[PDB]
Design a protein around this ligand. Structure first.
Ligand SMILES: NC(=O)c1ccc[n+]([C@@H]2O[C@H](COP(=O)([O-])OP(=O)(O)OC[C@H]3O[C@@H](n4cnc5c(N)ncnc54)[C@H](O)[C@@H]3O)[C@@H](O)[C@H]2O)c1
Ligand SMILES: NC(=O)c1ccc[n+]([C@@H]2O[C@H](COP(=O)([O-])OP(=O)(O)OC[C@H]3O[C@@H](n4cnc5c(N)ncnc54)[C@H](O)[C@@H]3O)[C@@H](O)[C@H]2O)c1
Ligand SMILES: NC(=O)c1ccc[n+]([C@@H]2O[C@H](COP(=O)([O-])OP(=O)(O)OC[C@H]3O[C@@H](n4cnc5c(N)ncnc54)[C@H](O)[C@@H]3O)[C@@H](O)[C@H]2O)c1
Ligand SMILES: NC(=O)c1ccc[n+]([C@@H]2O[C@H](COP(=O)([O-])OP(=O)(O)OC[C@H]3O[C@@H](n4cnc5c(N)ncnc54)[C@H](O)[C@@H]3O)[C@@H](O)[C@H]2O)c1
Ligand SMILES: O=Cc1ccc(Oc2ccc(Cl)cc2Cl)c(O)c1
Ligand SMILES: O=Cc1ccc(Oc2ccc(Cl)cc2Cl)c(O)c1
Ligand SMILES: O=Cc1ccc(Oc2ccc(Cl)cc2Cl)c(O)c1
Ligand SMILES: O=Cc1ccc(Oc2ccc(Cl)cc2Cl)c(O)c1
Lengths: 287, 287, 287, 287
């Protein structure tokens, strides 16, 4: 079979994007990485130097098959949208075709139609500030990068997808219950993402027969998580202590659920927020 | 190597229990049926006369294999719970080891420990009456058979299940939003079942490292559905017209989700209500 | 001009029923108490000896006025439901007209139609046991007394209530999120009560133009709370430490919300679970 | 008592802002209107010409006491934020001090500290487009005007509010369930508003002892509603046909709930989305 999945939001092997790639790879899905330009050249260097080799082993027989790796910035819908400062940036200057539309066109031109799409990215320039102290520009940046990027990804990628294709993104329970520390409008962006997942499920389901769901993951010590204010150290310790299942949450635990939601096995599931967090979301009072 | 599942609530090939059996069988899980004594002998006679042979065809290069078929009544926790009248009733008189504790013991004696458990049953004497007109006895009957039966199944089966085992039941969205026609306290029972799934997830996760979830299924023209009164024809027509995914909901659509939730692929999911209903639950206003 | 409220579930001045009585009395609503026969004679003796006189002071320029105090047992729908044993029991033998239908009739005969109804009661034989260890009989007892009693109260009282009347009950968040210690099927009963509030809102709204809602209250050191085992001290301490509003939750805090929901001011609200808990329900992770 | 309420988002007498003003006026609350500059001069003219006189009657005794009416644009946090095109606009040119911070300063300078705040506004330049066809600028405009404006209002107004003050905004159930027609990212903005209400409740409750809630209203034929694509004619007809309570939803039905949430009567309620919609949100299947 010719399953191809574009994963937008891989920067190294420590986040959920990598775990999803690994699990899809087990099912013989061809994988294309969309890599944020500021970290693209570093990623390629680490890859070439074999830094990721142990992380690519699926088992005794299998290694991750990575079809391609492309620069991708969810800040920009089309070529016209890139500002002067960015195009002049040292790191963007030597790259091209990294807007959402350009990446869709490039994948389709090289490999044809795909049938799986993963949104595994977020950004918020004021994450370290409380919501109350977040500026209009800060808040809108969170929503632009973390929420609107999903809509744009759908809008441009549906043209290059087969009927019965499937899309997932990643969210966090701070959208629904208060997590002090989860600042800069990230909580807001995740609330919008979960709502948009429903509305998009209606549009994509009726028009194209395409499904879209979102996985609400528990805490993982990824690069981005490090940026929140040992906030991640706290979250992990609390989850491992109080969740119904006292076991370390792995990126591939989210990967196996993603793989299921992206396969035909879940053909009757759409518009849903699925919790993959060892059950922590169900608890009220710590015991 | 030895995935075994007990499916409590199969009476024919037209309901969700059969769809779950078929999909599990696809994955080489050995299946044991728990059949309610009022329908048990008709079920066995049909099976023996080859009435289900076509329904057991997976892909015509593969057919379902069933390990065992056992009389089972989720009304009774232990042998000591069985009233003299039932014990001597025409349909129960020839059967043995059909209470929850007895079937668990029997299964263990014959096959050892199991790792998958499916609650696919419900009942309510007054389902034809709206909630407001449901009697105390009718309401308690619905809770007893449809909700408490899950707790009891858990209590007795956890002793014959391996750590990391998984349990699922089936629910309906009338627990959360009003569905006229879903009467007799069935809505109440499903609300209880969904809440008990969380509390059980806590106890079973912490004490035995066992997971439990519930699938909120869309409408299927099963024998039980037809007996509600027609109600099910309206539900199905409405769902096929207004759901994000306008496709016929199959018992095997539920089956494949059940299969995922019972497998190790869903190891970080517990306490959850997972909707498998073509996304109908996400809609507010029709078109 | 003739607001009359029946409050089912008052046994002393330390619970939510009293707080609701006090706030309604503030608004010149006439109040009728429904008192469970095991505590009825001790309640009346305390009242007569002036034990509640201080507790009846509203602002020391105003004191509660109580229209009537009636023996009431929400276990029994009609006189024909009362087993011979209860009928002849030491505490029931001297009382009459204490079933749901009889109290409705009595109230109507004496005061005519009423327009406000409060369900402020719960009970569960096995509340000290975790759900997994709760017996069938214990679980059904919790559903019978704590959830079904609301449906029955509605069925019999709608005949003695005016159109545009309002009904409220009390619930707890353990229905939606796991609270260790809230056992015996009380969590199940509250999940059922909250679901039944919606279904009843539909029937009562459409057929009688009557509204029904439920208040999910935070912790209060009532007699029933103390009897759970300590559990309530932990709940209160936790709530005062971690709730958005760090202030002592009063029975009259619930009372003033109840008063609003029972008045015409809330005429467009029905079927709802309203949280009155200093906002604790909105929190995920503590500080 | 000196209760003062600023209501941001009044353009005429046909929306929810006016109904909230009317009901607060009954409680002798002094009212200040924040009026969007494009409609400020028209509003003032209609007011002066007596167009609103019949709409201001509370009853036999009372007329609405409007303390002041000020231009207010939720697009701009501070004086510096206004762009050239706006400052040059015919309608803005003759007005001043209409940014969020400027209005806070102006109210405080004229009247001192207030204790009630109402956010009753929304805008989305692409509301007529499906979410899938909404542009990045369109989507962010919705979030900026409809969601971030609430945060900014809180940030600047808390300085001029008393302890134990209360804040409300208005939302719609399209945040939670799909409403085709509710386009341009308005669904997204409302999801973010409901989430932000929780996070702000935590910050404002712990730091200032101030409460914040949001009212999810049913459909009302306001000026803004007219802009959605007879979408409002449909919504109203559907609500009056299918809601549990079959009665016309009035602006003052939302006003009376707002008045309660803004008063001390609701001191234990914060971070909540309260539905004031005749119960329509509780229904799954039309009957
Ligand atoms: N790590 C957790 O604890 C956790 C919990 C719940 C949800 N999530 C979600 O999972 C997703 C993946 O994050 P992660 O935890 O794997 O951290 P991560 O750093 O591994 O992944 C985030 C990636 O997004 C990329 N990115 C940032 N801005 C971008 C832009 N403008 N365009 C394109 N890419 C951009 C970064 O390069 C980074 O590689 C995020 O959406 C996050 O919200 C994470
Ligand atoms: N059919 C639907 O449309 C639908 C939609 C949502 C959820 N569900 C749920 O799926 C489950 C299966 O229902 P179905 O639709 O497959 O109908 P079904 O008739 O196929 O399943 C019901 C089975 O449960 C068995 N049963 C009843 N009482 C029992 C008892 N006391 N002990 C043991 N077994 C008993 C019956 O023998 C019957 O075979 C139910 O719990 C139902 O609530 C069904
Ligand atoms: N106390 C809390 O912390 C708390 C928190 C959330 C919800 N609630 C709810 O508030 C309600 C009132 O409880 P409370 O905390 O005021 O305790 P309480 O003791 O004041 O109220 C319970 C009352 O119900 C009566 N009752 C019990 N069984 C009855 C029956 N069969 N018929 C008639 N009356 C019966 C008892 O006489 C008792 O007076 C309960 O439903 C409870 O679930 C309480
Ligand atoms: N009308 C309904 O059916 C309905 C249902 C649910 C929720 N709501 C909500 O109620 C609130 C009030 O809307 P309405 O229905 O009364 O319509 P409305 O037109 O009466 O009120 C909206 C007001 O917001 C103002 N506004 C728009 N952009 C602004 C800006 N940038 N700065 C300041 N003010 C601005 C407009 O002048 C207008 O007067 C809205 O938030 C809406 O989402 C309305
Ligand atoms: O522990 C919970 C947690 C940890 C990390 C997360 O990802 C991000 C958080 C903030 C930002 Cl700016 C970017 C990203 Cl990828 C997240 O969403 C939730
Ligand atoms: O269309 C929705 C639907 C149809 C059938 C269902 O199953 C039952 C419903 C009532 C009773 Cl008494 C027993 C059973 Cl198995 C159900 O739960 C939901
Ligand atoms: O702290 C939360 C809390 C405390 C008390 C409660 O009331 C009861 C709890 C159990 C039983 Cl059996 C009877 C009643 Cl009235 C309750 O519902 C929740
Ligand atoms: O019927 C539901 C409904 C009707 C009107 C509404 O208000 C708006 C809707 C869109 C825009 Cl751009 C601005 C506003 Cl004030 C709304 O929120 C929901």
């Amino acid at each position: 079979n010719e399953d191809i999945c574009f994963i937008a939001g891989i920067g190294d092997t420590n986040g959920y994007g990598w775990g999803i790639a690994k699990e899809l790879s087990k099912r013989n899905v061809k994988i294309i990485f969309g890599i944020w330009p500021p970290v693209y050249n570093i990623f390629m260097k680490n890859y070439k130097n074999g830094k990721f080799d142990n992380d690519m082993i699926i088992d005794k027989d299998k290694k991750m098959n990575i079809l391609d790796m492309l620069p991708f910035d969810a800040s920009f819908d089309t070529a016209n949208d890139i500002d002067e400062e960015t195009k002049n940036n040292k790191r963007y200057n030597m790259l091209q075709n990294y807007t959402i539309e350009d990446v869709a066109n490039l994948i389709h031109q090289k490999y044809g139609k795909i049938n799986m799409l993963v949104h595994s990215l977020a950004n918020a320039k004021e994450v370290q500030k409380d919501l109350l102290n977040t500026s209009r520009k800060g808040y809108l940046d969170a929503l632009s990068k973390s929420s609107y990027s999903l809509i744009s990804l759908c809008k441009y990628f549906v043209n290059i997808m087969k009927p019965q294709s499937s899309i997932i993104s990643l969210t966090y329970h701070a959208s629904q219950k208060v997590v002090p520390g989860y600042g800069g409008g990230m909580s807001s962006a995740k609330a919008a993402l979960e709502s948009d997942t429903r509305v998009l499920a209606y549009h994509l389901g009726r028009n194209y027969n395409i499904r879209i769901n979102t996985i609400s993951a528990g805490p993982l010590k990824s690069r981005a998580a490090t940026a929140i204010n040992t906030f991640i150290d706290y979250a992990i310790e609390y989850s491992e202590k109080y969740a119904p299942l006292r076991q370390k949450l792995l990126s591939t635990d989210i990967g196996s659920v993603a793989s299921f939601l992206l396969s035909r096995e879940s053909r009757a599931i759409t518009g849903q927020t699925i919790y993959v967090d060892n059950g922590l979301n169900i608890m009220f009072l710590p015991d």
